[PDB]
Amino acid sequence: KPRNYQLELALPAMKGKNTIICAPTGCGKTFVSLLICEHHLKKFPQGQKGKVVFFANQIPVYEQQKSVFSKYFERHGYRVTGISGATAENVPVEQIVENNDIIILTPQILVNNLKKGTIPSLSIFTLMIFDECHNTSKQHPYNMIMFNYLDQKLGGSSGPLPQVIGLTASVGVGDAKNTDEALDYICKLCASLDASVIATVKHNLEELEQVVYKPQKFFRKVESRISDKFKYIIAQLMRDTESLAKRICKDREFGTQKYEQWIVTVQKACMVFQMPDKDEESRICKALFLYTSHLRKYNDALIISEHARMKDALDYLKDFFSNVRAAGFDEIEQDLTQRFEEKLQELESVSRDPSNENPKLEDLCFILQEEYHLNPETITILFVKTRALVDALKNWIEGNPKLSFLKPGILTGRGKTNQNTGMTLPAQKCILDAFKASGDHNILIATSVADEGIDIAQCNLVILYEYVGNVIKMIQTRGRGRARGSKCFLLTSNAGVIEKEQINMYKEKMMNDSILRLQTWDEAVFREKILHIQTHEKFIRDSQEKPKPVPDKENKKLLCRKCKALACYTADVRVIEECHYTVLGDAFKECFVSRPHPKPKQFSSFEKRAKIFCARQNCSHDWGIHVKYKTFEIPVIKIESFVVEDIATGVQTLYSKWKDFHFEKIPFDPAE
Amino acid sequence: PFKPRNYQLELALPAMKGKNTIICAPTGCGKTFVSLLICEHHLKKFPQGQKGKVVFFANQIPVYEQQKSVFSKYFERHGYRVTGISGATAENVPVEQIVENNDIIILTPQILVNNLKKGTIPSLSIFTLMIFDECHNTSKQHPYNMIMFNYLDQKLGGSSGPLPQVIGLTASVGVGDAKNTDEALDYICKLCASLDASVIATVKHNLEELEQVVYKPQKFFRKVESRISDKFKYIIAQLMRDTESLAKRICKDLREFGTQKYEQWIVTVQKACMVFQMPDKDEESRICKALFLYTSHLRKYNDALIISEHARMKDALDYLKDFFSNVRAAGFDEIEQDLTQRFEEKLQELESVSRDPSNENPKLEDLCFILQEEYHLNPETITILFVKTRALVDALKNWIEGNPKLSFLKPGILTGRGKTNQNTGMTLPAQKCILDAFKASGDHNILIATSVADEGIDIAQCNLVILYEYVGNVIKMIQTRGRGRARGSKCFLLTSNAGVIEKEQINMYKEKMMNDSILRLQTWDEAVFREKILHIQTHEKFIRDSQPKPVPDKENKKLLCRKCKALACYTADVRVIEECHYTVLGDAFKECFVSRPHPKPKQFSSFEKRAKIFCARQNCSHDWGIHVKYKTFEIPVIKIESFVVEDIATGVQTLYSKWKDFHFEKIPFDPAE
Amino acid sequence: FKPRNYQLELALPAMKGKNTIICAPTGCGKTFVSLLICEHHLKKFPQGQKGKVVFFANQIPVYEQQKSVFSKYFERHGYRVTGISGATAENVPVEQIVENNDIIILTPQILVNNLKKGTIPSLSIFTLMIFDECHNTSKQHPYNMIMFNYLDQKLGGSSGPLPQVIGLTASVGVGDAKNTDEALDYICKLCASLDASVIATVKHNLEELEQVVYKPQKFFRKVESRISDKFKYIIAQLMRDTESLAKRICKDEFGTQKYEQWIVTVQKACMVFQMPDKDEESRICKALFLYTSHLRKYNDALIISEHARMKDALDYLKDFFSNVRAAGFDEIEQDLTQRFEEKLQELESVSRDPSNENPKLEDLCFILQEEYHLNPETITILFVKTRALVDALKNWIEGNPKLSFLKPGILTGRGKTNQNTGMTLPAQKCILDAFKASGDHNILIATSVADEGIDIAQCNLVILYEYVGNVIKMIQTRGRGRARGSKCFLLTSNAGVIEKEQINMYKEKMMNDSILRLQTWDEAVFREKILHIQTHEKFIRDSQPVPDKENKKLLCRKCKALACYTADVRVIEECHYTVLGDAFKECFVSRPHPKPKQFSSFEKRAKIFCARQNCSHDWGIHVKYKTFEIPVIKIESFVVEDIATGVQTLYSKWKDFHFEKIPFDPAE
RNA sequence: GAAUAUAAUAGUGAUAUUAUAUUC
Numbered sequence A: 001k002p003r004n005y006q007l008e009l010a011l012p013a014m015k016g017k018n019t020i021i022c023a024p025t026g027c028g029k030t031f032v033s034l035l036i037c038e039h040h041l042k043k044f045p046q047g048q049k050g051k052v053v054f055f056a057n058q059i060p061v062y063e064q065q066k067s068v069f070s071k072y073f074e075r076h077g078y079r080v081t082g083i084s085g086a087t088a089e090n091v092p093v094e095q096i097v098e099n100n101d102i103i104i105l106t107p108q109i110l111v112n113n114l115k116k117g118t119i120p121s122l123s124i125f126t127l128m129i130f131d132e133c134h135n136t137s138k139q140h141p142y143n144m145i146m147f148n149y150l151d152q153k154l155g156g157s158s159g160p161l162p163q164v165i166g167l168t169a170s171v172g173v174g175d176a177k178n179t180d181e182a183l184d185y186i187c188k189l190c191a192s193l194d195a196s197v198i199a200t201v202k203h204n205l206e207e208l209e210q211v212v213y214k215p216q217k218f219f220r221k222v223e224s225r226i227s228d229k230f231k232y233i234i235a236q237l238m239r240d241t242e243s244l245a246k247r248i249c250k251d252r253e254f255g256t257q258k259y260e261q262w263i264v265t266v267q268k269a270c271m272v273f274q275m276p277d278k279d280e281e282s283r284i285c286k287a288l289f290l291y292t293s294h295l296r297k298y299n300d301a302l303i304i305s306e307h308a309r310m311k312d313a314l315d316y317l318k319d320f321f322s323n324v325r326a327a328g329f330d331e332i333e334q335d336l337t338q339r340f341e342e343k344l345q346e347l348e349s350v351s352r353d354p355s356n357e358n359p360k361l362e363d364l365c366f367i368l369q370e371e372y373h374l375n376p377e378t379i380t381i382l383f384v385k386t387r388a389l390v391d392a393l394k395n396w397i398e399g400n401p402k403l404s405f406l407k408p409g410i411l412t413g414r415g416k417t418n419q420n421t422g423m424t425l426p427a428q429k430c431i432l433d434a435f436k437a438s439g440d441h442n443i444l445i446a447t448s449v450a451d452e453g454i455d456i457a458q459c460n461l462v463i464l465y466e467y468v469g470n471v472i473k474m475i476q477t478r479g480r481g482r483a484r485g486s487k488c489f490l491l492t493s494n495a496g497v498i499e500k501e502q503i504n505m506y507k508e509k510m511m512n513d514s515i516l517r518l519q520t521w522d523e524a525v526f527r528e529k530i531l532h533i534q535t536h537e538k539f540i541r542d543s544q545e546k547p548k549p550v551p552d553k554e555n556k557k558l559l560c561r562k563c564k565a566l567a568c569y570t571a572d573v574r575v576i577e578e579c580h581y582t583v584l585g586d587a588f589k590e591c592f593v594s595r596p597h598p599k600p601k602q603f604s605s606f607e608k609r610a611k612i613f614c615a616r617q618n619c620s621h622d623w624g625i626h627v628k629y630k631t632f633e634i635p636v637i638k639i640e641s642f643v644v645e646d647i648a649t650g651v652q653t654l655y656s657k658w659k660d661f662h663f664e665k666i667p668f669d670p671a672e
Numbered sequence B: 001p002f003k004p005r006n007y008q009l010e011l012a013l014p015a016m017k018g019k020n021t022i023i024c025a026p027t028g029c030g031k032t033f034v035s036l037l038i039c040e041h042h043l044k045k046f047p048q049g050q051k052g053k054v055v056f057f058a059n060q061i062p063v064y065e066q067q068k069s070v071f072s073k074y075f076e077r078h079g080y081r082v083t084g085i086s087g088a089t090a091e092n093v094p095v096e097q098i099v100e101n102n103d104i105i106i107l108t109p110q111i112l113v114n115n116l117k118k119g120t121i122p123s124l125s126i127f128t129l130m131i132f133d134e135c136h137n138t139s140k141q142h143p144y145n146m147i148m149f150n151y152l153d154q155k156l157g158g159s160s161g162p163l164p165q166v167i168g169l170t171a172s173v174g175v176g177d178a179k180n181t182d183e184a185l186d187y188i189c190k191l192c193a194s195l196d197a198s199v200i201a202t203v204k205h206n207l208e209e210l211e212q213v214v215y216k217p218q219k220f221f222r223k224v225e226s227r228i229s230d231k232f233k234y235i236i237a238q239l240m241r242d243t244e245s246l247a248k249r250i251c252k253d254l255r256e257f258g259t260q261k262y263e264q265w266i267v268t269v270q271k272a273c274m275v276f277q278m279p280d281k282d283e284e285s286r287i288c289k290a291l292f293l294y295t296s297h298l299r300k301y302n303d304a305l306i307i308s309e310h311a312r313m314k315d316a317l318d319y320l321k322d323f324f325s326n327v328r329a330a331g332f333d334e335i336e337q338d339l340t341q342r343f344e345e346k347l348q349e350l351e352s353v354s355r356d357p358s359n360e361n362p363k364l365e366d367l368c369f370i371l372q373e374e375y376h377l378n379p380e381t382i383t384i385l386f387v388k389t390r391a392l393v394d395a396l397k398n399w400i401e402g403n404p405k406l407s408f409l410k411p412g413i414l415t416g417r418g419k420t421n422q423n424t425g426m427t428l429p430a431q432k433c434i435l436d437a438f439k440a441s442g443d444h445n446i447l448i449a450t451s452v453a454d455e456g457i458d459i460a461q462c463n464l465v466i467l468y469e470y471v472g473n474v475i476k477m478i479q480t481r482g483r484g485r486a487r488g489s490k491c492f493l494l495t496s497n498a499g500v501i502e503k504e505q506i507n508m509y510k511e512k513m514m515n516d517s518i519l520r521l522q523t524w525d526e527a528v529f530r531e532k533i534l535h536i537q538t539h540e541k542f543i544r545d546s547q548p549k550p551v552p553d554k555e556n557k558k559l560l561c562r563k564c565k566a567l568a569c570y571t572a573d574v575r576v577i578e579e580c581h582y583t584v585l586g587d588a589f590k591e592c593f594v595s596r597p598h599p600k601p602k603q604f605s606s607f608e609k610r611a612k613i614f615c616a617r618q619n620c621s622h623d624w625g626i627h628v629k630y631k632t633f634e635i636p637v638i639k640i641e642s643f644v645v646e647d648i649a650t651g652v653q654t655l656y657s658k659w660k661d662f663h664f665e666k667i668p669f670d671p672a673e
Numbered sequence C: 001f002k003p004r005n006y007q008l009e010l011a012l013p014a015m016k017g018k019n020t021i022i023c024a025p026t027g028c029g030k031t032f033v034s035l036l037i038c039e040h041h042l043k044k045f046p047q048g049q050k051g052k053v054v055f056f057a058n059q060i061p062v063y064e065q066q067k068s069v070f071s072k073y074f075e076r077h078g079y080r081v082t083g084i085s086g087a088t089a090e091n092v093p094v095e096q097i098v099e100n101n102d103i104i105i106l107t108p109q110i111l112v113n114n115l116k117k118g119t120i121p122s123l124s125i126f127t128l129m130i131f132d133e134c135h136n137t138s139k140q141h142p143y144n145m146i147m148f149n150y151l152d153q154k155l156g157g158s159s160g161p162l163p164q165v166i167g168l169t170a171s172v173g174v175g176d177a178k179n180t181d182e183a184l185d186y187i188c189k190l191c192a193s194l195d196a197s198v199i200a201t202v203k204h205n206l207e208e209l210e211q212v213v214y215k216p217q218k219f220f221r222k223v224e225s226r227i228s229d230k231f232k233y234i235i236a237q238l239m240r241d242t243e244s245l246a247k248r249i250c251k252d253e254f255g256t257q258k259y260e261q262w263i264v265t266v267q268k269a270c271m272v273f274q275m276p277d278k279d280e281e282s283r284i285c286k287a288l289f290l291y292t293s294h295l296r297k298y299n300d301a302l303i304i305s306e307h308a309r310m311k312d313a314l315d316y317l318k319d320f321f322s323n324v325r326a327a328g329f330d331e332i333e334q335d336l337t338q339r340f341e342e343k344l345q346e347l348e349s350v351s352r353d354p355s356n357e358n359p360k361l362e363d364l365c366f367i368l369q370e371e372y373h374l375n376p377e378t379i380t381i382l383f384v385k386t387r388a389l390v391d392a393l394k395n396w397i398e399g400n401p402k403l404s405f406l407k408p409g410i411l412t413g414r415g416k417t418n419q420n421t422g423m424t425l426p427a428q429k430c431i432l433d434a435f436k437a438s439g440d441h442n443i444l445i446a447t448s449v450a451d452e453g454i455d456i457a458q459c460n461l462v463i464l465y466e467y468v469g470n471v472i473k474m475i476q477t478r479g480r481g482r483a484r485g486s487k488c489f490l491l492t493s494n495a496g497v498i499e500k501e502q503i504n505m506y507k508e509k510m511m512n513d514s515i516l517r518l519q520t521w522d523e524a525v526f527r528e529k530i531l532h533i534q535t536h537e538k539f540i541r542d543s544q545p546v547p548d549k550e551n552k553k554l555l556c557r558k559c560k561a562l563a564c565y566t567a568d569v570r571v572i573e574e575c576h577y578t579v580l581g582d583a584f585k586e587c588f589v590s591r592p593h594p595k596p597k598q599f600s601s602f603e604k605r606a607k608i609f610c611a612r613q614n615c616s617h618d619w620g621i622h623v624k625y626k627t628f629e630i631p632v633i634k635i636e637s638f639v640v641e642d643i644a645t646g647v648q649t650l651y652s653k654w655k656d657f658h659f660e661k662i663p664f665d666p667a668e
Numbered sequence D: 001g002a003a004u005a006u007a008a009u010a011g012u013g014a015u016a017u018u019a020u021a022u023u024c
């Protein structure tokens, strides 16, 4: 049955007003959605019918809402359907939309179908419901859909538009430093969604506050490790490496992001290093590549060491040199691997010493010990920045004798689609189903979760380990511990993290006050302001087009970034669906080898079968993948794996995305 | 009359069942009514041929008067005589008969301590119920702890006869310097042992109600930077170095300016210059006086630097201007004239630097930003602003009144009573007058204050609290929340020192430990807890039973003025009144001092303050003590802190802070002489 | 607080040590005057000596208010402030309490009782006595008794020092004086009763006083009575139906006070009717009692109907016949109730028509409408004579749609101590604290307040609905509307009321004139005249029966049943009367007391009633006295009968019953 | 239970009746 504050939140929407509904995470948004949809569909007369679309930007939420909606609206004469990438191709989208009254949808589907024209107008819908509507900004699919919406609204405008509902726990305030800037941001968000009302709980605050409780937050400022002999050894290793790199080619503190941002630039600048003798250029470029890569890995190791155990860093390095040893053994790689193996002894000697322990981990252990001593039934979630740090802390917990009461579990993202990393959806679902009080896992170590997501087991202890986020995620993560007495511990040694979190707190205050102020305005006047903002933003958006770079028709050569080997020419390149890039000719097929794809999935009219690597003298550089497009079995490459050196001027240039590499892109033809 | 909220009955329940109890609940939840419930039930529980006698302990006169009034109006109907005894009504009255002929007695704990000590009240068995307001003060050498020492001594000792039930009232028991759960539990258990408490009562079954009555304000942390360019500091520092050189050029002598380190140093140096020896001894007077003047001016300059660092340069410069204004109109002095003119030299440059808007304190700017924002969002905002010193109070009032951007503010002042023998602070009827004007429809919009002892009387609710460079304990942290019980109240901690923020965070974690420890203790069996606190009591008593006097000195000494080293009197002339106060005999001493009418004439003990006495030699005007009417005698009373002790024989000069540390042949005052 | 100049002026004679009567308008702040006088008085004494003040308040609210104010004020100066009232008077050492305190707030009756006892042997223990509302110092009032002690010590050979005497009032009164001479006589006699030699009034600061206390403008409203008389017709022949019924049992201008007096006399005459057959005497006497009671109730209903709605009277009778039932079945009660129930229809038909309205209620409604239309923020106070009229006008206001803007509250006395009527003190405090501008109530219906009392919310509109009073009450009521623009409306249908209020105004003139004339006299001469009046009054006061030892029977006044014999009666504390033996225990039933109070050494537990065949006539109460649980009876509930002669006599008070009164003894 | 005051109505008045309020 409906809680009164849910009816309160749904009321403005039930009156047909475009509404941004803002309420605490876990107060029950699903049911509000159900109310709004029900009322909306039942309001039409006989000769007319309604059609609702529900946007969820995550597959688990998509499936959940699809399930609940179909189970709920079955009794009523309303057909519910769902569409995602898993079921998107060779299906008549327009028919599915037309033959159903409720459509749960990944926004990208609607974007693609709007662009391709299969869905000519949003007038087909009478109600659009954006889950996590705060994402309606910039180049997000939500904002694309609303760009279509507003383009229709401010344009010829002769077709009718659907009602718009947004759901969120925080509208955000941007980089606002005062209430008026925050108010401006909020008004612009309302404009992006064409919203005239922001709905919040006011008359039922008691009811809401005996369902959702705000966890008590604590700040923990510890200090760095005063002694780091580990860093003293690794530093010498790194400067030996860059000394070798300096020796081969004659043209910032270690363990920092600055050194990483530097070494990435250096590696990017060594790739374009050119010589008349191509062999020597190849040798030197590959050598510098390996050098910069090793340096990067050493830096990563230092970072891991400062954020966790020395053993975790040393194991990271061990697995890296394992990586390298397995992937062909080169003489310079032999030199570097050696160069790690003399110091390996001293490193393991330093790491085994209890003297050199991270105080951050000691404080974390102190918190865990205290809380679980007070309550052995404690359910904990532990957020960190990187997956390496996830595994690191898992090993630390499983290793620490004083934490034997903990049963650690892991929760990371899917990782990159073309890399054997991350974690599949069924694995996540498995560990999450295992993560209960009656389950196997006691504490869940995780990186980060996009928005609210599916409700998991309630955690009476949240720990933010060197964790930085915005105000939105700050408000959202409260949903992890809704039970009264829940605690959140921000643990760090950066001081700036603390200030950041406090700034986010003040930003929450600004947001709430701005909402309160905005709600006192007259709706008509606010609609006028909204329209003005929409016209303003549309003008700025249309003015920002600037399309003009003339496609270079002079044929260029693509050289492997690692070994500078000639992959192919731009003349051989064909573009499929204006997005993907393949190569024709039997010549190119002998320039690469293939290995079975780690994460095979049928994206678009493609079917990943394998990853392709450089074949030239053990290079094994990632060039792209191999797919089964329609009737053809063809390779697909990425420009960030090559170097554009054109025949004439002979100057090498780097591109990260094909959208920036302007040349005579020839469309793909089956008759070729 | 009213009607008890459920959680109030829940809090009162262990007490009504006769258990010794510490009631711990948020500030403003309504403790007076809980007290009334407990007292009413307690008194009405006795049969016909018996009667109860309740004593209530408030350690503040306002709370004393409040509780006296409330209990009087409440229990008069039920036929229970209510009375009270404060320091103002404790002398020349039969305390024993007053306690005997009343059912409820509101009391300042010191009255009971002194009357137990004298024997006018032979035992606590006369009471059947003792209530300690702000019971967390029951520790160390606090009067509460003295009373409970008497109580416990009667308990454990062969002493018997019935002991009264003991109730304590607080919002926070504290955890002391605990670092974890076990230490916090140790501390809390030791407090329960101090109060002989077997039960800690909190709200559990009616949390929703309480939360609908008392809301926790949202706390924000504001870290800002200090001013970076400070010419004021440079000029003042140069003045300080000049004064130091002047001090060195007169006497052979042997940290940074604007710190507590410099303050400790200059105090040490002043005290050291006081024991400077010369054979001439009339040049000793000149040199010592000069050094005293120099060190005093240096101290004032340092204070100026600090005020400047926490406020406007104008505030510091006005502080100095007021200081030299006090130096003037006191009398002419070559040294004082020299220093004054040395200040008047740099005065122009100082004023020009002080008027430049490019040197505004960013802390005051952020404060102004906060006030502006919150009053823009709600012009009916009632604000309370806590600062460290009274100088900063005055400074911030002046700043607010002098700031056009804060024209919507109507600042009021709230400070302590100040030292009893100085014309500073603020009188109680003044605090009352200002607090009564501190309303939404009153004359004042924002209240600038130093600090408050515990909770105190309920003033107007503030939806905005601002801690300006403020550092307190977990108890005061929890207590100050009562200033904003309403939903939506906000508290801003504004500082430029990260240690402050960190300290408040530590306090929050300490609150967590306190709550968790209490929750843990509440699960224990009552008998086990009784046993544990009994063992703690027995141990602490065993320690206290033998935790040693020293021998006096019969050799006659001299008391010289610390400023001018002039002979005031000999220790042979000194008599001791009531083992605490010290007077001088002989008509010789009468020619050594001048006097002015006392700024705060109050009757302490058997004395009545009439005047303050000062050194008379060559307009020294150094504070020696006071002049009072004790019994029938009009006599002076002096503090040892004003003099230096020079032994006749050895010639050694020594300093003593308290008379209790000055071990000499203390002759008792005798009216027969 | 900083003193206003007229307060310093009024206080000045007292601070000079003069026995003074301070007379100034209500609301000018007499509390701070008292504080000034007390502060100066206590602080004037040298070191080796000390002063002691006693403050007299005749009301518990004033008592507690003054106790609190004096406590808060004088605590810091070093003076212990205490108080004693009836609630805290028993089993406490009064002498020690007085001795160990500097300022004692007191209900005068406590001092009277302790003076009579001997615990306080003399008034010499006090150095200053202050009488709040000193105009009460007359006749057999507690103030006057205290002053009888005072003056008996003064004029007597007692050389002991007497305390300075201060009185506080807004009107000294003039009695029934017809001219300035008699007024001056009376005022001089009051000054003699208080031993005052000075009357302090504002003179040099009248302009200051008149800007703090404004005199409200009075208006006189003479309206017409009920021209209609149908309701009265019905109830009238109902009354001679009942009168014929009563006349058909034994031998021998409705809606008036004379008829009420007469029917009371008739009931009290029927109570002594005797016969050979005592049972038929019982039946007949009970009959006559019931009939007379019904007649009385009908009369009361008529009065209510003339001063209010017919519906109010009909509801009064309805409530009456509602309480006649649930008390028990009586043949005659059933008869009468039937005789009423048959005409109920016509009565309500008459009470429903809108052509039936009291012109007085319409005029009051017009006044309220005009005043609240001119000012909706109006705070009205409406005085009536009876609580029945209070409830009646409350119902009339809440019923009338034209008075929708009104939020009527109630303010009555505490009623008789042994009845389920009136209103408790905390209830009074509740409604009063609700009666504010921004409160729950706009208009407050009330009967009468003892003197000035505690300051309530300022009423810019005061209405006297058929309400006469003396000059003192007239002057005091002005305190209800001190703000400029305050109005008073004397609404009535009698020329008597208006004429007596005008007479009161003239009496105020006489009073002020007499005072101003007295203030010109030499103080020595005035003291001589005062001493003269005091000596005369003492001579008169020190002016000049055998108890019938024959046993008597106490019969129930209603059913003539035997309660007890006078031989069984014992007297406690020379005032109360109890019964011994197990026999009397079979004669009465009891109900738990509606107002359990702890007066004296007694604690009220229950009311007691006649038990024989559901007579239920109030005989008295049942109390806890020390260790014993005993009945206490009132003689006005019984008919006395002599054993030998058989005479039947009535007594309204025990002190008028001169029989052999045996002192109660625990050893029996 | 008792005491007290005010007002109205009877009586020349002492006083009495009712109403109202207060107190122990």
Ligand SMILES: [Mg+2]
Pocket: C300, C303, C386, C388
């Ligand atoms: Mg009547």
Ligand SMILES: [Zn+2]
Pocket: A560, A561, A562, A563, A564, A565, A614, A615, A616, A619, A620, A621
């Ligand atoms: Zn390659």
Ligand SMILES: [Zn+2]
Pocket: B561, B562, B563, B564, B565, B566, B615, B616, B617, B620, B621, B622
């Ligand atoms: Zn001196």
Ligand SMILES: [Zn+2]
Pocket: C556, C557, C558, C559, C560, C561, C610, C611, C612, C615, C616, C617
């Ligand atoms: Zn009877």
